[PDB]
Amino acid sequence: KGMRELNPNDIDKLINLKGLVLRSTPVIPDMKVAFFKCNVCDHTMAVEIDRGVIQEPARCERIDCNEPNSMSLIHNRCSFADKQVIKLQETPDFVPDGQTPHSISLCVYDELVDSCRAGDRIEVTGTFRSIPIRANSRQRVLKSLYKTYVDVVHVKKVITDQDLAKIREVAAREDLYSLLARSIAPSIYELEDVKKGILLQLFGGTNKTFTKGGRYRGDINILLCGDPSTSKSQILQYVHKITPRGVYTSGKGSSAVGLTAYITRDVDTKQLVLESGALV
Amino acid sequence: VRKDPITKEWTLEGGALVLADKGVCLIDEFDKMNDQDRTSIHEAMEQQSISISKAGIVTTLQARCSIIAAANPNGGRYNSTLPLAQNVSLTEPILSR
Amino acid sequence: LPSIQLPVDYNNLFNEITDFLVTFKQKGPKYMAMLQKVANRELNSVIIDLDDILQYQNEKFLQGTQADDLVSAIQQNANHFTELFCRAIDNNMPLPTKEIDYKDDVLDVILNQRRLRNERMLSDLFPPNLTRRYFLYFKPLSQNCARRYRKKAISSKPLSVRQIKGDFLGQLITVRGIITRVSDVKPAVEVIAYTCDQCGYEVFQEVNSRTFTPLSECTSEECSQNQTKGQLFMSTRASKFSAFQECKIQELSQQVPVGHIPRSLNIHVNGTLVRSLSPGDIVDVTGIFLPAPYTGFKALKAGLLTETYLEAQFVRQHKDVYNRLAKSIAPEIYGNLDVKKALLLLLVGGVDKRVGDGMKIRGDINVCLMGDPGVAKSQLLKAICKISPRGVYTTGKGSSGVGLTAAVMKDPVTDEMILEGGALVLADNGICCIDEFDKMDESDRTAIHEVMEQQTISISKAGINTTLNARTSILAAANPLYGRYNPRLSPLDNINLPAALLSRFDILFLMLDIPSRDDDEKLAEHVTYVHMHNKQPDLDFTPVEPSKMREYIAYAKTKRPVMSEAVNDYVVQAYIRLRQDSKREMDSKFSFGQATPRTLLGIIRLSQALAKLRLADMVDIDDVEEALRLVRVSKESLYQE
Amino acid sequence: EIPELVPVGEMPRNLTMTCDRYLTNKVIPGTRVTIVGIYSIYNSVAIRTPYIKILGIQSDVTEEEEEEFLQLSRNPKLYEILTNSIAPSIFGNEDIKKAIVCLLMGGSKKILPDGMRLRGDINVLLLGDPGTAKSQLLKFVEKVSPIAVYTSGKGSSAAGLTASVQRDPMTREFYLEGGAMVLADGGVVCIDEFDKMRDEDRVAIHEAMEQQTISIAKAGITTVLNSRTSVLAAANPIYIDFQTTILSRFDMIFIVKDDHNEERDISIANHVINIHTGQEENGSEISIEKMKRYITYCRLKCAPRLSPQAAEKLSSNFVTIRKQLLINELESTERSSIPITIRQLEAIIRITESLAKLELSPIAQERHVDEAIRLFQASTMDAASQTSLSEIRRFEQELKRRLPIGWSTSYQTLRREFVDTHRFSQLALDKALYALEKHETIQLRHQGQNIYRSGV
Amino acid sequence: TVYPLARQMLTDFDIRNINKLSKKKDIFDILSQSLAPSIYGHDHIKKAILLMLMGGVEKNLENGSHLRGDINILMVGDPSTAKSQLLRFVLNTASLAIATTGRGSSGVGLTAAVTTDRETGERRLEAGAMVLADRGVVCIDEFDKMTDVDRVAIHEVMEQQTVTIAKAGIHTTLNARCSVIAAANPVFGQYDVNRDPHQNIALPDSLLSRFDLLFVVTDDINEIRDRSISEHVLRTHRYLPPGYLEGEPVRSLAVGEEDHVFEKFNPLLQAGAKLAKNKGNYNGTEIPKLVTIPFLRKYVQYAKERVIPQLTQEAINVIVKNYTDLRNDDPITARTLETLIRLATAHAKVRLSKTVNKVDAKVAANLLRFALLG
DNA sequence: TCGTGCTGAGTGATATCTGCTTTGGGTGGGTGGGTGGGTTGAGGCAAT
DNA sequence: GCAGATATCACTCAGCACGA
Numbered sequence A: 001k002g003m004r005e006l007n008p009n010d011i012d013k014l015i016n017l018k019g020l021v022l023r024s025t026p027v028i029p030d031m032k033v034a035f036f037k038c039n040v041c042d043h044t045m046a047v048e049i050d051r052g053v054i055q056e057p058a059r060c061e062r063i064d065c066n067e068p069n070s071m072s073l074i075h076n077r078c079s080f081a082d083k084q085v086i087k088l089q090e091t092p093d094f095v096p097d098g099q100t101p102h103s104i105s106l107c108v109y110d111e112l113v114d115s116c117r118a119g120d121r122i123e124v125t126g127t128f129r130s131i132p133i134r135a136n137s138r139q140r141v142l143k144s145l146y147k148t149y150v151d152v153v154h155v156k157k158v159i160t161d162q163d164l165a166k167i168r169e170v171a172a173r174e175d176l177y178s179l180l181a182r183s184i185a186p187s188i189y190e191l192e193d194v195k196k197g198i199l200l201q202l203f204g205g206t207n208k209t210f211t212k213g214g215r216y217r218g219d220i221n222i223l224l225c226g227d228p229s230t231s232k233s234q235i236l237q238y239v240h241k242i243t244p245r246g247v248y249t250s251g252k253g254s255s256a257v258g259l260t261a262y263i264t265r266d267v268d269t270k271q272l273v274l275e276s277g278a279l280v
Numbered sequence B: 001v002r003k004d005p006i007t008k009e010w011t012l013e014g015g016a017l018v019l020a021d022k023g024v025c026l027i028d029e030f031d032k033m034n035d036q037d038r039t040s041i042h043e044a045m046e047q048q049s050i051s052i053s054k055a056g057i058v059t060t061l062q063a064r065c066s067i068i069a070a071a072n073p074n075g076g077r078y079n080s081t082l083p084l085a086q087n088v089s090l091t092e093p094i095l096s097r
Numbered sequence C: 001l002p003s004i005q006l007p008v009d010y011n012n013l014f015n016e017i018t019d020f021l022v023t024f025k026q027k028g029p030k031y032m033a034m035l036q037k038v039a040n041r042e043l044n045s046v047i048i049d050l051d052d053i054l055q056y057q058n059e060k061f062l063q064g065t066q067a068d069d070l071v072s073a074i075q076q077n078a079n080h081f082t083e084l085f086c087r088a089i090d091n092n093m094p095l096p097t098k099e100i101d102y103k104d105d106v107l108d109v110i111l112n113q114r115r116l117r118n119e120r121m122l123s124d125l126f127p128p129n130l131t132r133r134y135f136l137y138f139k140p141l142s143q144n145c146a147r148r149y150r151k152k153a154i155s156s157k158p159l160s161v162r163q164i165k166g167d168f169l170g171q172l173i174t175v176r177g178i179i180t181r182v183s184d185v186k187p188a189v190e191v192i193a194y195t196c197d198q199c200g201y202e203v204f205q206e207v208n209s210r211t212f213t214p215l216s217e218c219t220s221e222e223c224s225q226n227q228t229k230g231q232l233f234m235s236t237r238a239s240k241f242s243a244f245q246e247c248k249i250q251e252l253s254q255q256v257p258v259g260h261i262p263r264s265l266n267i268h269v270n271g272t273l274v275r276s277l278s279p280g281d282i283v284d285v286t287g288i289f290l291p292a293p294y295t296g297f298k299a300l301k302a303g304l305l306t307e308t309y310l311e312a313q314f315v316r317q318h319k320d321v322y323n324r325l326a327k328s329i330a331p332e333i334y335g336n337l338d339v340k341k342a343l344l345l346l347l348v349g350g351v352d353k354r355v356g357d358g359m360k361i362r363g364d365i366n367v368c369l370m371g372d373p374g375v376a377k378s379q380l381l382k383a384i385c386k387i388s389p390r391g392v393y394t395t396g397k398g399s400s401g402v403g404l405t406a407a408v409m410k411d412p413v414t415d416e417m418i419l420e421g422g423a424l425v426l427a428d429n430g431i432c433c434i435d436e437f438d439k440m441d442e443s444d445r446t447a448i449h450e451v452m453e454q455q456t457i458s459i460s461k462a463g464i465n466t467t468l469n470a471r472t473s474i475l476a477a478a479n480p481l482y483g484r485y486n487p488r489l490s491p492l493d494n495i496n497l498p499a500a501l502l503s504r505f506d507i508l509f510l511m512l513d514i515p516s517r518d519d520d521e522k523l524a525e526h527v528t529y530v531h532m533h534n535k536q537p538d539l540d541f542t543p544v545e546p547s548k549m550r551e552y553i554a555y556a557k558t559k560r561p562v563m564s565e566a567v568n569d570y571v572v573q574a575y576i577r578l579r580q581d582s583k584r585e586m587d588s589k590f591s592f593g594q595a596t597p598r599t600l601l602g603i604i605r606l607s608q609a610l611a612k613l614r615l616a617d618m619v620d621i622d623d624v625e626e627a628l629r630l631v632r633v634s635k636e637s638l639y640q641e
Numbered sequence D: 001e002i003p004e005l006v007p008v009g010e011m012p013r014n015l016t017m018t019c020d021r022y023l024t025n026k027v028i029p030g031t032r033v034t035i036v037g038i039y040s041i042y043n044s045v046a047i048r049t050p051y052i053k054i055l056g057i058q059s060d061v062t063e064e065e066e067e068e069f070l071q072l073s074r075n076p077k078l079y080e081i082l083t084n085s086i087a088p089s090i091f092g093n094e095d096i097k098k099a100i101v102c103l104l105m106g107g108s109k110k111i112l113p114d115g116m117r118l119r120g121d122i123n124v125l126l127l128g129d130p131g132t133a134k135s136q137l138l139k140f141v142e143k144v145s146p147i148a149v150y151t152s153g154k155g156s157s158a159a160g161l162t163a164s165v166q167r168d169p170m171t172r173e174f175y176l177e178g179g180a181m182v183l184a185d186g187g188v189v190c191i192d193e194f195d196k197m198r199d200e201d202r203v204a205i206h207e208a209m210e211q212q213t214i215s216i217a218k219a220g221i222t223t224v225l226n227s228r229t230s231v232l233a234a235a236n237p238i239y240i241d242f243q244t245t246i247l248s249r250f251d252m253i254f255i256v257k258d259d260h261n262e263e264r265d266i267s268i269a270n271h272v273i274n275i276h277t278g279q280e281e282n283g284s285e286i287s288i289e290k291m292k293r294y295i296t297y298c299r300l301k302c303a304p305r306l307s308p309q310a311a312e313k314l315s316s317n318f319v320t321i322r323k324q325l326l327i328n329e330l331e332s333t334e335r336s337s338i339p340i341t342i343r344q345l346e347a348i349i350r351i352t353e354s355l356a357k358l359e360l361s362p363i364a365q366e367r368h369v370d371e372a373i374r375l376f377q378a379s380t381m382d383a384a385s386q387t388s389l390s391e392i393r394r395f396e397q398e399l400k401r402r403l404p405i406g407w408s409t410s411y412q413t414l415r416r417e418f419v420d421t422h423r424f425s426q427l428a429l430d431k432a433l434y435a436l437e438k439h440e441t442i443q444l445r446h447q448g449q450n451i452y453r454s455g456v
Numbered sequence E: 001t002v003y004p005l006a007r008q009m010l011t012d013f014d015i016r017n018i019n020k021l022s023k024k025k026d027i028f029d030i031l032s033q034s035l036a037p038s039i040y041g042h043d044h045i046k047k048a049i050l051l052m053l054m055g056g057v058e059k060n061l062e063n064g065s066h067l068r069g070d071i072n073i074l075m076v077g078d079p080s081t082a083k084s085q086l087l088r089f090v091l092n093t094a095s096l097a098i099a100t101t102g103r104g105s106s107g108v109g110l111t112a113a114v115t116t117d118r119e120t121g122e123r124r125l126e127a128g129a130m131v132l133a134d135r136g137v138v139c140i141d142e143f144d145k146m147t148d149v150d151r152v153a154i155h156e157v158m159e160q161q162t163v164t165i166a167k168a169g170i171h172t173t174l175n176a177r178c179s180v181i182a183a184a185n186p187v188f189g190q191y192d193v194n195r196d197p198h199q200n201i202a203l204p205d206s207l208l209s210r211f212d213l214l215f216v217v218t219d220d221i222n223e224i225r226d227r228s229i230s231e232h233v234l235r236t237h238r239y240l241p242p243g244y245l246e247g248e249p250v251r252s253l254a255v256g257e258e259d260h261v262f263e264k265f266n267p268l269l270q271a272g273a274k275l276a277k278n279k280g281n282y283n284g285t286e287i288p289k290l291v292t293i294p295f296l297r298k299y300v301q302y303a304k305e306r307v308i309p310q311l312t313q314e315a316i317n318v319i320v321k322n323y324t325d326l327r328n329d330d331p332i333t334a335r336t337l338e339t340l341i342r343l344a345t346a347h348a349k350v351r352l353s354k355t356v357n358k359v360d361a362k363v364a365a366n367l368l369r370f371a372l373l374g
Numbered sequence F: 001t002c003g004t005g006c007t008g009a010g011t012g013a014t015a016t017c018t019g020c021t022t023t024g025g026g027t028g029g030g031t032g033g034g035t036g037g038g039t040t041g042a043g044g045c046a047a048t
Numbered sequence G: 001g002c003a004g005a006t007a008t009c010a011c012t013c014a015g016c017a018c019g020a
């Protein structure tokens, strides 16, 4: 379903959504089983929580001691679970006429906590729940408009021995260099040396950990300068697709600070933080 | 300008020139100061008073202090041939003062 | 509470309404059939047309059995007649004819169990709104109906936010304006359902205000006779919800008095009308103008001032082919036939964008129009740029502060670096429209290459490291700053554009204005005939209508042709000849049009454009030979002269 | 608290006060007062806010003084004594002294039923090299005038002068707060260092003096304020931002230049030494208090007007000035800049009325006419006068030819090529560069240190 | 209650009066010189200003093309040539006008620009001077003090006649159909004849080309003219607020609510208007048939709201011939043809005729010739 | 062997009572309203 | 007029000792 097609009819039903993660709150402890201790006889009992309500006892459950209202909650002995709140923004494609994309809040508990990072495309299955909002802190009064959110039950972020036996077969091929150089950029024609140079950058040198000095890194830097119409930008895009991480920065569209890192402040936490530039 | 924790009414602090009234205001690396800061000292050099207008606290403060300034000539060295005008970037008024 | 004797009777009006729904006949009775459809779950919205009420009233009066004026009663107080109509529909509802599912009906199992329990207890219910699954809306009284039957229509008469005063509160009126804000659909609760953990009985509470107080203790007769203190707990699976949207409507520029600022009126949408209003739209919305009484302590401190709103009820929306479709790019302009052909090719956007294992080839035919002031460039630019469904006319400086490509600005309020797109992005999936192409700054001078080569803008500045998607073809023009062009001097000697930029353009045109008696005579005569009769002097051809030409352009852009080996041979031979020719022309320093593979791809693109205009699928030798003429006549006549 | 009693390095302390019934509207800001009242405390750990409940106000601010002033006006050398009292401690600069006297007295107001009311106030411009006592003159003008504001152009900003739109913190509503000119309404504003003041503030002042009603009526409010004031401007030498237009707005322009005469130098040295080692007030000078009360009386009582014969004589004087330039333009091809402007003509008037008001003369006679003529001639005509365009044409052509399109050369390099070579003077460099840049044919980069061509 | 502290409904005989004046075959001079009668000389400017005030028919083609039908005028000249006086007079006689000076137009901006609150960030589109003059006139002042932002905005505004705002999440289009009159001093403080007007002003050809007619005026010194100006300016100073001792300290009844047409001669005000009918002859004592401003406003109102002239062949032959002669014989651009037709229709509106005739085309051509070549 | 009238004890429901704001800040708004108040200054970064 | 925290009073129940 689309984020703009959820109606009241579809409340309390299992739906499937896809979107982009925008922001996630830190871990929130959610109580599961409460712990009570009698102030008089030092008797301890555990009571369950139903619908966010503690089934507190009126008086001590022991027979000899029955002092009413003498039970107290020991905060640090109650069982707890994990809770987290995420904000999901619909994919840019779904936007009908170029407006601000809508967002829907999600809740994930236990294992699914810290499963999706900020700025990732995920597909989430959960229950489309509804819940009241209290008009003010100090009253049971409720607003007539209900808040909508999704109770997530599954999240999907959108080597075998057989493969290893297969991979080891290619390495035996005598013309492996040509095969890989021809497969890295199928479309580009008669640039075998350029392709070979590009390929060796993906593999990279060898890493060395080195005390009594500094680390030595096997990273290769390549410059492709030549006449305009030749396939330079095409190879740039082709390699940009293959690599797992990379930023397609251009000329005059990037800044000195923008490449390295930007100093900023976090509004939510009100602390000085720094972002990661294109190079970082 | 600060905010008084008791009356919650904005008060006004003292500046470097004010703190050195009836004394001396020493400035080092004078030539390196920006134009606006170098204008801020023009008033104290001759008018002997600093005027302030912030947060509706318009008033005039007393600043009667002598100023000793140290600087190096523009270009890093004093060319004895050329006059003092080109040697230092300070404008004619302040030099006269 | 002193009482007044108002001249309105509700029993008689209810009887009239009941008779209306069972007797009116615009096939059996119209509204009986409409209700029959609802009982089968095929319709979830009944719209009562006040024109039908007026017709029924006049028919009854003609027979001599005059009755009360129901139409005037509905408009004067509309919030009450919704309940009357709903009650009448419930009373006269028919039994279903098509077999219903009845399987996953929570409020059928609940009601069946509630009936069984009540019968068993009594032998030894639920609010009417809960069972309702239809929405009742009122259609205003159209002006034609009012004038037909000699009456005045107050509801349909459009008004403005300025004219909606306190006197109109509680009436059915129409408002004309532009929507400026819409909200996400949210569920507004209408009937809450609780469950007692002791009785097994359900308690239903009606909510008809902005706020409500939840129930705590059970009120069932079981909890009363036994006096058990059972606790009620809310259950959203059995409650009733209605989609809710809040919007804003603002006055048009034609309704604000001089020296006054536009006003805004809130609109509430409930039921099925939700999602019928979108931002930036001119509508005629009919609804009930009601207040929103405050609740709690806010009522005492708020005062007598009342916050009002509009309850939407109805929404009305204010809505040789080559030579012929070329001479019709701007019939008013006289000369420049080949240029107009090139602009038509630009409009078609002729390409069959090819994506294989990742390679992307741009499918946009960029074109530039250089020359001297006086030749019809800007007029051509605005005409060609209005023809397309989507276009953006801007100067070389850019769209206001943000320049063409994009720029990151510090937020005035949040102090957060926010990227705002420029003119190019606003033309995505369209033709951007640039005049004074010379006046670009360095940033755009360098960043326009990205868009022209790869349809995307990439920025990696302080806080933003994203890429803007801009698949827009570019049309540009420039003129000497002071006087006329000097053909003897190099093209770069009169304008500031760098040599590299002009190379990327698929077609480059140098337009010249050489004074001459004969030419100016005909130019003046043509502009003159246009100024006299607003049509072309020559009668040899009839200019094609605008809407029909736009339809043809859309149909052509739908098609996707392909090439073949036979035409491929011709294209490759022509490219070989072009490459060989440039081997000698390299001496001239202004030969930025030197043939490169980009020229081959441009030839292919133009050929596909011509094929698209023919609406065919297979490109023939004719299209390629014509396209090669437009690349030739665009350099030869504009490099040799 | 009084400035004198403030201990060194500390700050003035404030105290809130309250008055009721017939003690209200008895003082205005900036007036020294003596208060008799109850020192009480009102609740706003366990502290209270002190305040004072006023019971009596006695501020330092009849017919006998009228008789004394009338007798003073009967003196046969009133003009000379008044010009002597203006800056008794500054030697020379007699013309500036007389101009400052005229500014202090001002000109009679003019109002027409149609709606076009002419200005009556007088503004003066002092533009000389450092070490000339311009600031001392401005200080004395500020002190002597009953209402005056001394403001440093660079110290303040657009908010300081004219007016600025702000927001009331307590009520959070946009309101308008006046600047120096607003606080100087009905008085004199002495602006110092006209050069360092920013261009936007200079144009704001231009408008304020043009209409004397600072028009800031927008941004939540539509209120306007009156700024009827006289502006005395002291500016450092130009050695154009100081364009001749703003000078033309000024009624009077003065270029102070001490001549290197041994007698003059010794005289000034003796005067300053007498100052350091140091009061006729017996028929040749009057203290600040008497002069201030004099100014108040003359500004509030007498508003004299010129005479028909004087009017015709002044018209003939302007005719003779135009004929004087006609004589001056012995050149055949070269064109004279300006003989006079109509604004300058209006400037010539309203100073004669100042002299008439000085002597309480109901009608200005020919004496005032000749005095005003001499004063204006000694200040503006010579200063304005204190070929080139054709040279600028050649300079512009050479600059355009030298630089192709897109090629940038350092401004210092161009100065070396032309200014140092002496083919074109520096005053012809900035003018031509501004003319070219304003037309977009050239661009200034690196604060004008690099010149980049941007088209034909 | 509240007591307060545009258009004049024409009566039956006012239309008869306007027709009576229209029939007189000299009315163009009368109307031209009735406006700003005090000013000496610059008669062609007054003629062109009236022609601008009455504008020309605006054509809307079926293709959506919009041929501009509003004249524009730019004044450039040495100091003290009554530029501000002409601006004031057009402001007083024009139905709509906003004198938003180009130098830091505090108050109402020259063009629309959205604004936000400092703390609440309340976005709102604040209309500028150009937008607030739809179907009217805008009298810019000191056109030479404009900043690059204003120049770029004005270029688009005039070229397109409409403003489309696409900023701060606000997308809207606001009409700006109007006429622009502006004054601009030279760059060196004085007009140089040896240089072109495009050199004495420092705006790019893009801005100057939009102005249909450009006028260059210089301050010339003539003894008799000097005496006349001096005496006229002097008169006001001795003129007084009658009511209190001459020359001393100077200080609605209801809310609900043929000297009328012509004007009696006044030496104090008109002055040069007599010289106008005298054809530059001071000795000439031809009292002119000037018309009061209140009725002139009615005349312009009636002409602008009732007459829609249509081009005619007789005027069109001469239009084509004059344009060809200008272009091919003593840079003139094809846009000057639009000027000829626009002014021909505007003048035909003065003659209260629904068809443009040869006289209108010829007089418009002569005015354009003066506006181009001295 | 046992039955019942008197008593102290403790909840349940109900009586008065205080409180009904509260708060600094722009993901709380401006159809909640200014008699409920909010009055910086240095440092970093894009534009040029 | 409305919700929440708080304290007041009145009514009814299980134990107790004696008398039947």
Ligand SMILES: Nc1ncnc2c1ncn2[C@@H]1O[C@H](COP(=O)(O)OP(=O)(O)OP(=O)(O)O)[C@@H](O)[C@H]1O
Residues within 6 Å of the ligand: C332, C333, C334, C335, C372, C373, C374, C375, C376, C377, C378, C379, C435, C436, C477, C478, C479, C523, C527, E206, E334, E335, E338
């Ligand atoms: N062939 C033609 N047919 C009709 N009108 C023409 C023709 N050639 C020129 N014109 C007229 O020339 C005038 C020139 O003004 P226009 O708005 O076109 O400026 P431009 O010089 O093309 O613009 P820019 O240089 O700013 O890009 C227009 O009125 C146009 O009507």
Ligand SMILES: Nc1ncnc2c1ncn2[C@@H]1O[C@H](COP(=O)(O)OP(=O)(O)OP(=O)(O)O)[C@@H](O)[C@H]1O
Residues within 6 Å of the ligand: B046, B093, B096, D089, D090, D091, D092, D129, D130, D131, D132, D133, D134, D135, D136, D234, D236, D268, D271, D272
């Ligand atoms: N004739 C004079 N008599 C006395 N002092 C004089 C005279 N001429 C100049 N001065 C000098 O004027 C000084 C005060 O004025 P100041 O020189 O600051 O004015 P200024 O030239 O406007 O200053 P600056 O140009 O440096 O801003 C005194 O220190 C003083 O001795």
Ligand SMILES: Nc1ncnc2c1ncn2[C@@H]1O[C@H](COP(=O)(O)OP(=O)(O)OP(=O)(O)O)[C@@H](O)[C@H]1O
Residues within 6 Å of the ligand: D342, D343, E038, E039, E040, E041, E078, E079, E080, E081, E082, E083, E084, E085, E185, E229, E233
């Ligand atoms: N033809 C004229 N007839 C009468 N008075 C004239 C004439 N030309 C100019 N003047 C006089 O010129 C005086 C100056 O007018 P104004 O201040 O408007 O000049 P301006 O040239 O527009 O000014 P600026 O140079 O400051 O832009 C006016 O008082 C007017 O009396």
Ligand SMILES: Nc1ncnc2c1ncn2[C@@H]1O[C@H](COP(=O)(O)OP(=O)(O)O)[C@@H](O)[C@H]1O
Residues within 6 Å of the ligand: A187, A188, A189, A190, A227, A228, A229, A230, A231, A232, A233, A234, C361, C453, C597, C598
């Ligand atoms: N050897 C080649 N193989 C494949 N395509 C080529 C080759 N040479 C040129 N091209 C084509 O020419 C175009 C060159 O554009 P581009 O790669 O953007 O050049 P650059 O990035 O160097 O400016 C490409 O779109 C590509 O399709």
Ligand SMILES: [Mg+2]
Residues within 6 Å of the ligand: A232, A233
């Ligand atoms: Mg590339």
Ligand SMILES: [Mg+2]
Residues within 6 Å of the ligand: C377, C378, C435, C436
């Ligand atoms: Mg153009």
Ligand SMILES: [Mg+2]
Residues within 6 Å of the ligand: D134, D135, D136, D192
């Ligand atoms: Mg000084």
Ligand SMILES: [Mg+2]
Residues within 6 Å of the ligand: E080, E083, E084
């Ligand atoms: Mg002027």
Ligand SMILES: [Zn+2]
Residues within 6 Å of the ligand: A038, A039, A040, A041, A042, A043, A060, A061, A062, A065, A066, A067
């Ligand atoms: Zn216990």
Ligand SMILES: [Zn+2]
Residues within 6 Å of the ligand: C196, C197, C198, C199, C200, C201, C218, C219, C220, C222, C223, C230, C231
């Ligand atoms: Zn129950």
